[PDB]
């Protein structure tokens, strides 16, 4: 019985995790059980990547996603992104894995023996979905927790070794951040940037000063609002505008994860600062820009004047202009003239790419960096065959940028479906026609005709 | 009382799998067409007919396995096992494509048996035979594509091959050679398919969101027994919803469910007529006014001319191997190519 | 009372011929803007350079097109993903030359199309209905989001989106096959099973209901007059239809429950089209279909071609011909 069958709980077996909407104890054991399952994969997958890891090859040629997450933080990598010690990766894998057992120890307890209710076990842990004050305090509690975790990232950047910075002068290297940007005209200047080409919204961040300084504004804002929602209760205008039920709160969070899901997709695809190209591989625009420079170097070495080279279309074969006048690469890569990369900026001047510095100041490390990124463009098949759709089998490669973007778009869309499902439902459950129209009081029959 | 009525009683016995007089034609033909495809895709090759591997034994996966059509030199031969080609050898019968006609012909009479099964059962339970009439569209599609089309060309070679990847090649062949997307009979066929998928989703969703509360369970599936006399969902509430959201709405249940029969069935019939025209190369390939203009105005360009350039690429690049009997040899300098690529 | 309260009562009024609603306050102006611009552009818009190589493409009727070939041409590849409203061009003539109207139409459309989905929830809430009709409409909407925005984003230019025309759509399907091999991707395969089965299950359910109508009319008049609007009776015998279809296959391959059945009719095509929408959205980031080129090889090393190697030949023909002057380098990475 105990609301574990359809006759008593009203829900079928395929919707039976909804039999806990008012079982605070068993529902507590379910979340901590699922919380331990993520921590488990976090450690179990990292040790797997370390076991199959090879230092001599780039990380994007081996299908890693989390080792670059640890490497970007500055742990285990030296100049140029080369791995110098695999021991930090081992600790992160074990500590995340050893910690998977303790939550799994409690997630099983609060779900099989733990008090299926906590409202009579403790006034502090027991809650009511309709209790607007008890809910805003649990929100405020977890706000302070997440606010602290935001200040942990800057604690790593300013005090504990620093972060790997691809824009470091003379090559990528880890660097301690000493002047975090706190100017609100800059930090909040990102939120109002257009999300279109040339602007990029918050994806356009390109220096660890702004990344670090932005994470400490977030750190205090979540602490201030955390204390705020502990000492306050929703105002009048907030109660008559929202649905206050257990499922309605779930639907508010599904639409929030969906939005964050789509944002992270465009991040890893476009951004090459917090997602370094030395670890995740070159972006889409980056690799296409790299092809135009690869063949500029080749043809110019043979006597071609790339500045006056007229292509078949009438536009420049190697160089042209953007609609605003900047000197950009030619071909189909004209669409990617907004890309900025450390291997290309030395050749950029007041009016775009400088023809004189192109003839004189191109270095052999740029010729390899351009070639390497050209042969690792984020193109590949589902069975992991590198290249375009007409390539033959040989190079086993698809870019981590591809796995991370496609996967987190699939989730962000499905969670948008979850919002639509659970949000429209909590409305119909709060009303109370979520199970069908009443026969003796059908609303449409009481309304005037349309014609 | 004779043997005929005694046999008639046994066939129409209410058992787990109904046999019926139609079963004498349906069951053996449906079992051999399918079993012939499973035997072909598992063991049989197509090396001497197409120059391709096509079985699991050769290294193909579920997507690339296929029972390829016979060679082009075989013409429209039935390729019977006892025929003048194989001369009774089962090994040589598989090596020249006898299984393709073995599957197409046995499968054709299998479709006839299944449609006769729909007429026979409908008469016994006393219903209207509208389900059998609706099955006429998948039959007209199968006859025009797998039989009338190859009979119009050179041989069975240019008919579809029973495979997942061999069917994808069939569409790209029709784009490059027939411009089958521009044919208005495929356009009506597309509208009949996408339209039926629209009605199927919008009717089932409207039913699920206009039901009456006939139960006390949060999962509203147990609130129904097949022996009611009252409607399970409100028809007048669903009518007002769609009248205000979309403009019009269904008001008759009998018309609604006939409309769901007419739209997808008519769509397939129209697309079958377009394939019957392509068997004679009667295509909708060109717009003459466009070509007269584009030939004397080197600045006039539309999406119509851009697609023809794509058609000219598909033909010149896939022909030498897709049609190996022609012995096509194109030097590198005659292949249509754009810049760089 | 006050006028704002009276205004809110009219916007949410259930007695309007066409329901407005708060989603409708946004949907109506955005749609009206998109159709009025689309109608005018389809008829009299001057040629558009889509590929950004000073090669305009005629798309309107007055410039030598018909209904089959006419199209509203995507914006120039020189713009890429840049926002290009009317007030960013030095005039209208410059705006029309660079494919300006294309952005204004698809933006105002996707906005109004999304509010159209929320408008479905809104009226369901005011009529006592369950809310999940909008979820079924999310499948065709997400499909429109894929070919109009998600794919231009992953490729970096609105010039690569689906044109607003009949032949323009055909140009979008052919190039998508040459650069992503969509036919060999499972999500498009799941999408075909959703639309093929969708039409299959549509014809089936429509036939079985029209096979068991209660006899309530003569032979001289239509059978539809056996049903009257708003009647409590079900005009067809459900267990009679179950007795027929259960004998064609077997008893347990037939739905005895009407609610379980219409859910299957709604579920199958919606999640099927969800995948083919997700198929376009994932191949936008260049995770293409299965590649089996030269995957079978003999004991010496000769390539034993399969049906996949023939598909690669037709793909090579499209790839070397599409945008015949837009490329200067041996690889087409976007």
């Amino acid at each position: 019985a105990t609301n574990r069958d359809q006759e008593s709980s009203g829900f079928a077996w395929w919707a039976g995790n909804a039999r806990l909407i008012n079982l605070s104890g068993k529902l507590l054991g379910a979340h901590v059980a699922h919380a331990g399952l993520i921590v488990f994969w976090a450690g179990a997958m990292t040790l797997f990547e370390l076991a199959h890891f090879i230092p001599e090859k780039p990380m994007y040629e081996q299908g890693l996603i989390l080792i670059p997450h640890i490497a970007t933080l500055g742990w285990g990598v030296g100049p140029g992104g080369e791995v110098v010690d695999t021991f930090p990766f081992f600790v992160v894998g074990v500590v995340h894995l050893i910690s998977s057992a303790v939550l799994g120890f409690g997630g099983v307890y609060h779900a099989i023996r733990g008090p299926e209710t906590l409202e009579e076990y403790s006034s502090f842990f027991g809650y009511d979905w309709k209790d607007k004050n008890k809910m805003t305090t649990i929100l405020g509690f977890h706000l302070i927790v997440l606010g602290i975790g935001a200040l942990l990232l800057v604690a790593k950047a300013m005090f504990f070794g620093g972060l790997y910075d691809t824009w470091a002068p003379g090559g990528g290297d880890v660097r301690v951040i000493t002047n975090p940007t706190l100017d609100p005209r800059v930090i909040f200047g990102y939120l109002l940037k257009s999300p279109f080409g040339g602007e990029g919204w918050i994806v356009s961040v390109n220096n660890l000063e702004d990344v670090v300084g932005g994470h400490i504004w977030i750190g205090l804002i979540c602490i201030a609002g955390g204390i705020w929602h502990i000492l306050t209760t929703p105002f009048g205008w907030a109660r008559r505008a929202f649905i206050w039920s257990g499922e309605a709160y779930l639907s508010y969070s599904l639409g929030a994860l969906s939005m964050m899901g789509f944002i992270a997709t465009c991040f890893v695809w476009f951004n090459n600062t917090v997602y370094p190209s030395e670890f995740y591989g070159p972006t889409g625009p980056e690799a296409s820009q790299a092809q135009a420079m690869t063949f500029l170097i080749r043809d110019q070495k043979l006597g071609a004047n790339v500045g006056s080279a007229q292509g078949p279309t009438g536009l420049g074969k190697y160089l042209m202009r953007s609609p605003t006048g900047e000197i950009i690469f030619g071909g189909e890569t004209m669409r990617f003239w907004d890309f900025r990369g450390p291997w290309l900026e030395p050749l950029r001047g007041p009016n775009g790419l400088d023809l004189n510095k192109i003839k004189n100041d191109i270095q052999p490390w740029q010729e390899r960096r351009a070639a390497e990124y050209m042969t690792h463009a984020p193109l590949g098949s589902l069975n992991s065959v590198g290249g375009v759709a007409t390539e033959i089998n040989s190079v086993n490669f698809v870019s981590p940028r591809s796995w991370l973007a496609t996967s987190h778009f699939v989730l962000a869309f499905f969670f948008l479906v979850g919002h639509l499902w659970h949000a429209g439902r909590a409305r119909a459950a709060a009303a109370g026609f979520e199970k069908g129209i009443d026969r003796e009081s059908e609303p449409v029959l009481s309304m005037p005709s349309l014609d | 009382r004779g043997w005929f009525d005694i046999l008639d009683d046994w066939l129409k016995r209410d058992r787990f799998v109904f046999v019926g007089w139609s079963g004498i034609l349906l069951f053996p033909c449906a079992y051999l067409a399918l079993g012939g495809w499973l035997t072909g895709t598992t063991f049989v090759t197509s090396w001497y007919t197409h120059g391709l591997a096509s079985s699991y034994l050769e290294g193909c996966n579920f997507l690339t396995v296929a029972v390829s059509t016979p060679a082009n030199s075989m013409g429209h031969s039935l390729l019977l096992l006892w025929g003048p080609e194989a001369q009774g050898d089962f090994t040589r019968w598989c090596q020249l494509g006898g299984l393709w006609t073995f599957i197409a012909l046995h499968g054709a009479f299998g479709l006839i048996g299944f449609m006769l099964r729909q007429f026979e059962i409908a008469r016994l339970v006393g219903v209207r035979p509208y389900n059998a009439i609706a099955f006429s569209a998948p039959i007209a599609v199968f006859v025009s594509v797998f039989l009338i089309y190859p009979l119009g060309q050179s041989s069975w070679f240019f008919a579809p091959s029973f495979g997942v990847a061999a069917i994808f090649r069939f569409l790209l062949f029709f784009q490059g050679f027939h411009n089958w997307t521009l044919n208005p009979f495929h356009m009506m066929g597309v509208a009949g398919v996408l339209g039926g998928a629209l009605l199927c989703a919008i009717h089932g969703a409207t039913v699920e969101n206009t039901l009456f509360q006939d139960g006390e369970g949060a999962s509203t599936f147990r609130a129904f027994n097949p022996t009611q006399a009252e409607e399970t969902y409100s028809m007048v509430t669903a009518n007002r919803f769609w009248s205000q959201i979309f403009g019009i709405a269904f008001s008759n249940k009998r018309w609604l469910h006939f409309f769901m029969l007419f739209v997808p069935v008519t769509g397939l019939w129209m697309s079958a007529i377009g394939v019957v025209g392509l068997a004679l190369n009667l295509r909708s390939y060109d717009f003459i006014s466009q070509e007269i203009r584009a030939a004397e105005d080197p600045e006039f360009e539309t999406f119509y001319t851009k697609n023809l350039l794509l058609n000219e690429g598909i033909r010149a690049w896939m022909a030498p191997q897709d049609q190996p009997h022609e012995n096509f040899v194109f030097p590198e300098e005659v292949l249509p190519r754009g810049n760089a690529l | 009372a006050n006028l704002w309260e009276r205004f809110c009562n009219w916007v949410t009024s259930t007695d309007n011929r066409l329901y407005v609603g708060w989603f409708g306050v946004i949907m109506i102006p955005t749609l009206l803007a998109a159709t009025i611009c689309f109608v005018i552009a389809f008829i009299a818009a001057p040629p558009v350079d889509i590929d950004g190589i000073r090669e305009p493409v005629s798309g309107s009727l007055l410039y030598g097109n018909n209904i089959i070939t006419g199209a509203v041409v995507p914006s120039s590849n020189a713009i890429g993903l840049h926002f290009y409203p009317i007030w960013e061009a030095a005039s209208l003539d410059e705006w029309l030359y660079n494919g300006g109207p294309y952005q204004l139409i698809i933006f105002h459309f996707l906005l109004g199309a999304s509010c159209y989905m929320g408008r479905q929830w809104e009226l369901s809430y005011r009529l006592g209905m369950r809310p999940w009709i909008c979820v079924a409409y999310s499948a065709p909407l997400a499909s429109a989001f894929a070919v109009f925005l998600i794919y231009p984003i992953g490729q970096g230019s609105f010039s690569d989106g689906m044109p607003l025309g009949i032949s323009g759509t055909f140009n979008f399907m052919i190039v998508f096959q040459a650069e992503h091999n969509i036919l060999m991707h499972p999500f498009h395969q799941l999408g075909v099973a959703g639309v093929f089965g969708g039409a299959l299950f549509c014809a089936m359910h429509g036939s079985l209901v029209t096979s068991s109508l209660i006899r309530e009319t003569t032979e001289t008049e239509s059978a539809n007059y056996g049903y009257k609007f708003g009647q409590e009776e079900e005009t067809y015998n459900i267990v009679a239809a179950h007795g027929y279809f259960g004998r064609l296959i077997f008893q347990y391959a037939s739905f005895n429950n009407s609610r379980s059945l219409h859910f299957f009719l709604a579920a199958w095509p919606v999640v099927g089209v969800w995948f083919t929408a997700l198929g376009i959205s994932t191949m936008a980031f260049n995770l293409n279909g299965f590649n089996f080129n030269h995957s079978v090889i003999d004991a010496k090393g000769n390539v034993i071609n399969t049906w996949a190697d023939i598909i690669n030949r037709a793909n090579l023909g499209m790839e070397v011909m599409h945008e015949r002057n837009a490329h200067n380098f041996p690889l087409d990475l976007a």
Binding site: - | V236, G247, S251 | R17, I43, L61, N66, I67, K228, F229
Partner: peptide, 30 residues
Amino acid sequence: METITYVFIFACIIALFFFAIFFREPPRIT
């Protein structure tokens, strides 16, 4: 003559929408 023929048919279909909505046969209950 072509352009006038296409827009004339398009205008009739739009005019057909206005009557099929605001001048439909009212559905009545009994």
